Amino acid sequence: SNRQEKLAQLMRQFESGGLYLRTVSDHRDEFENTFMPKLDACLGHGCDERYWSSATFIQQGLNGKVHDPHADRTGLIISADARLGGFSTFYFPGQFPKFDMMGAYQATWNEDIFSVDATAVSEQQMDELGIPDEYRSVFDFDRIQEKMAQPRLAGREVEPTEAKICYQPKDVLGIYVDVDSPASQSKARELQQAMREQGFDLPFIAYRGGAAQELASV
Amino acid sequence: MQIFVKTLTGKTITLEVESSDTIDNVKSKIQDKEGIPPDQQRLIFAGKQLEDGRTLSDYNIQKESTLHLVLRLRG
């Protein structure tokens, strides 16, 4: 799809069930060592799921922060259709913990929490331990929406969330730009050019506070 | 290597360790800095409490990793 179709898809998802935002510290690394190997496989013998990535869930009205300690990151807006490996409010599949051990302990002070492996625990055992749902991970897209529904509806600001996803080139819908950051804009500019030259003409997207806006050129 | 140990009351501890250190050895280094006998320590990493007898490599703990220290009565 061309730029206008990617933007239309992006906003359609943002304004309904949401989608992903992946900030990156080094856009050349993301391009050369994650996006390009994915594309090489897609155009070769077929797309595969060798590269997993971290991302945040974004959605209209969800006042969610993104991870950018120095306000100097660009990033990728990624379709909701990306393969999902796990989500928490706090790599290969199997490594996502079912619950946040340290968070759950400071919630319940139940020392029996330390007798289990948070990657190998049953639903029954999590219920028996009393792990509150606030500290449990989820594993399908509908449950991400549910986990974030209450702060979204309240208009309440939330910290960055963590999803592990496997995106394919077709899933990249936009380039993240931090409106307050010359460095983010400089990096986003380079990333967008490189992606367009590969045949992926993407809009610049200013995400902030549960709102997302298309930009001409940064 | 350098690893970090967070307590339940805000504190970050820095330790120099080798990849083949046993968990008992790491707890001895924590004792030296924090005064907690190793039988009174829990070390948590990536959602698991670490067993005595095993090493940092047995848990694939790499450099600049953060562990979480929790105090216990005994064991």
Side-chain angles (χ1 to χ4, degrees), chain A residues 1-3 5-89 91-127 129-169 171-218, chain B residues 1-15 17 19-23 25-38 40-61 65-73 75:
Chain A
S1 321
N2 63 0
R3 185 187 163 284
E5 291 161 0
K6 295 290 182 180
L7 172 64
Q9 180 179 354
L10 198 159
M11 296 298 284
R12 174 161 61 254
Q13 294 189 1
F14 187 68
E15 308 190 328
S16 55
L19 70 172
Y20 300 108
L21 196 157
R22 168 162 166 69
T23 69
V24 303
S25 50
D26 180 352
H27 80 268
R28 175 195 296 197
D29 182 56
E30 188 72 12
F31 178 75
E32 287 185 328
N33 296 321
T34 301
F35 176 83
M36 281 310 302
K38 287 169 177 295
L39 186 59
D40 294 343
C42 284
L43 301 185
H45 291 294
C47 304
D48 68 56
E49 301 180 351
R50 289 190 309 251
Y51 286 79
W52 291 78
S53 311
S54 288
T56 301
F57 173 82
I58 59 163
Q59 187 180 24
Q60 188 187 29
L62 169 59
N63 189 358
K65 298 181 175 173
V66 314
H67 180 62
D68 193 351
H70 305 106
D72 62 4
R73 294 191 171 191
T74 181
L76 303 182
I77 307 298
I78 290 161
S79 163
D81 289 328
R83 267 279 276 136
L84 170 67
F87 176 83
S88 60
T89 53
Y91 178 98
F92 293 113
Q95 217 168 4
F96 211 91
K98 313 291 176 269
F99 72 97
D100 169 8
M101 182 168 284
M102 291 314 303
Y105 181 64
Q106 307 174 65
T108 69
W109 293 89
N110 180 5
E111 293 189 20
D112 295 326
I113 283 159
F114 303 119
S115 68
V116 313
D117 174 352
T119 62
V121 54
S122 71
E123 299 290 315
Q124 258 167 320
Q125 181 73 262
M126 286 199 292
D127 292 343
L129 292 170
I131 305 299
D133 273 46
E134 307 91 280
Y135 300 93
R136 300 188 186 198
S137 309
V138 295
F139 294 96
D140 66 43
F141 197 71
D142 191 60
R143 288 163 113 113
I144 297 177
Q145 296 166 338
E146 274 180 325
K147 196 159 271 288
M148 305 311 297
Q150 291 308 302
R152 180 175 58 78
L153 289 166
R156 173 166 60 77
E157 192 179 27
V158 298
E159 289 294 305
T161 57
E162 173 82 3
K164 280 296 182 189
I165 62 178
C166 180
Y167 71 85
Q168 300 302 340
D171 297 324
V172 186
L173 307 185
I175 301 302
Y176 170 73
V177 192
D178 186 324
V179 69
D180 292 326
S181 176
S184 172
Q185 302 154 13
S186 307
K187 299 168 175 178
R189 186 184 309 136
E190 304 282 339
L191 181 57
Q192 197 273 343
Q193 168 66 23
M195 297 275 275
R196 185 176 65 76
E197 291 289 289
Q198 293 294 333
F200 297 85
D201 188 8
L202 305 171
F204 297 104
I205 298 301
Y207 165 80
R208 186 167 298 280
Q213 184 152 355
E214 160 207 15
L215 296 180
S217 292
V218 306
Chain B
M1 71 195 339
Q2 197 190 21
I3 60 166
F4 310 100
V5 183
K6 278 232 292 170
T7 76
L8 283 179
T9 72
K11 186 177 191 177
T12 301
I13 305 153
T14 303
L15 303 171
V17 294
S19 314
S20 53
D21 286 345
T22 62
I23 296 313
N25 180 201
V26 174
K27 297 181 173 181
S28 278
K29 294 177 181 181
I30 289 174
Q31 183 180 25
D32 286 344
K33 289 192 181 279
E34 304 298 302
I36 305 151
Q40 280 183 330
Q41 310 184 18
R42 306 179 188 278
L43 285 176
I44 315 299
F45 170 79
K48 42 193 98 49
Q49 152 167 310
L50 308 187
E51 318 181 353
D52 311 318
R54 302 160 163 226
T55 73
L56 288 175
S57 53
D58 294 343
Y59 294 106
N60 312 118
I61 292 164
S65 291
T66 300
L67 281 49
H68 294 267
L69 172 64
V70 170
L71 308 197
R72 73 180 296 161
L73 199 57

